[PDB]
């Protein structure tokens, strides 16, 4: 099976350089050009450049000529991309791809490395209840998961037992460089007097686990 293996993520500081790897298997490495593609969160694909692993010939997109540097290691069938002088504009998923038997195609893609460029230090979230002051058939409750770094956190409700009507929103990066997210759940108004609601918030990087009871 043709496979291109890439690390899931790289957390790195602005102003430094980072080396992304793409380990190929299941075919003759030197037969097919390897390309790299950038995709910023929620935006489009951008073509970085291509390298011929057989001879090291490389064509860059002019936009990336100083930012990206392509190499391969023939002996370990691995393609590398170094990104230099990192800034927040470089935070993105970076894919490696391999051309097909028709050279004008990308049939094979790595799963991509998520590179996040930040000067922020690890920090666990504060968890605050969300409950209206409040008639209606549906009540909402939630937790505000604020001021943490880095991504991600996992939020569950009642230890996983409550999944219906749960919405956990995408985190937003505040100007402080910390993340903030809400997780909410809607439930029948009638349950408010009989059932308890607790959000379970887990943040591995800080080794933080918070369970917060939300009183309607």
């Amino acid at each position: 099976q043709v496979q291109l293996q890439q690390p899931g993520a790289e957390l790195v500081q602005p102003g430094t350089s980072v080396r992304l790897s793409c380990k190929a298997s299941g075919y003759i490495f030197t037969t097919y050009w390897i390309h790299w593609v950038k995709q910023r969160p929620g935006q489009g694909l951008e073509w970085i450049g291509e390298i011929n692993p057989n001879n090291g010939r490389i064509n860059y997109n002019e936009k990336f000529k100083t930012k990206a540097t392509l190499t391969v290691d023939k002996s370990s069938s691995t393609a590398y991309m170094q990104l230099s002088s990192l800034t927040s504009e470089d935070s993105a998923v970076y894919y490696c791809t391999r051309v097909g038997v028709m050279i004008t195609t990308f049939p094979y893609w790595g799963q991509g490395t998520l590179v996040t460029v930040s000067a922020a230090s690890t920090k666990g979230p504060s968890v605050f209840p969300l409950a209206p002051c409040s008639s209606e058939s549906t009540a909402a409750l939630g937790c505000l998961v604020k001021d943490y770094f880095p991504e991600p956190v996992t939020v569950s409700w009642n230890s996983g037992a409550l999944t219906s009507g749960v919405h956990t929103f995408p985190a937003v990066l505040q100007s402080s460089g910390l993340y903030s997210l809400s997780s909410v759940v809607t439930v029948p108004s009638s349950s408010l007097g009989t059932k308890t609601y607790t959000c379970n918030v887990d943040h591995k990087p800080s080794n933080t686990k918070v369970d917060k009871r939300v009183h309607h």
Partner: protein, 215 residues
Amino acid sequence: DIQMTQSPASLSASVGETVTITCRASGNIHNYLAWYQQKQGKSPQLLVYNAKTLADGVPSRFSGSESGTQYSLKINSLQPEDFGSYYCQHFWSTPFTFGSGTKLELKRGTVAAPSVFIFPPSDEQLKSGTASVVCLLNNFYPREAKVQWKVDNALQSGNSQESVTEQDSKDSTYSLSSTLTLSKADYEKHKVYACEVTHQGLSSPVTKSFNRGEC
């Protein structure tokens, strides 16, 4: 340099419908044009190449066509698995550019008004010197909604952020959170905190509010 101009940026369609996605090359790229599909949080996958050849495994409801510098991806009888993003890419000269993308979302048969809820800042957060106020718009369709924060009936700006979920696979709705963030001192200047919501499912805008100190 050859650039690909893709359109439309967004498409809403129901299962069983047909759509057309278009890309114009800014110069002759011959037949060197590929199409890719990408699902949320997955890598893109090849759909079509040489402008009109289906990749292995791609169902025949997909077709690619070429007319000079105009290229089209057509999908007949859309199925649930077809929703997501689509990109064209040329491979003629360096750089091998992608179109800007098309997001294909599901058109729910009927409009669904948001259920709206407002959440005051907690006593605990207030201790720390900040007040986050959260407005939730739950399970609405279509995606377009206007959320406006009003403080003592004055319109707010530049102090809130919105976040939205991925369209629900089951009911085709979205939910959205808008967070208003104020220092404790600013929070304590005013009494009435309200979020006003405009949406196609609401004959009149809906306003949910609380009074600081009420809860």
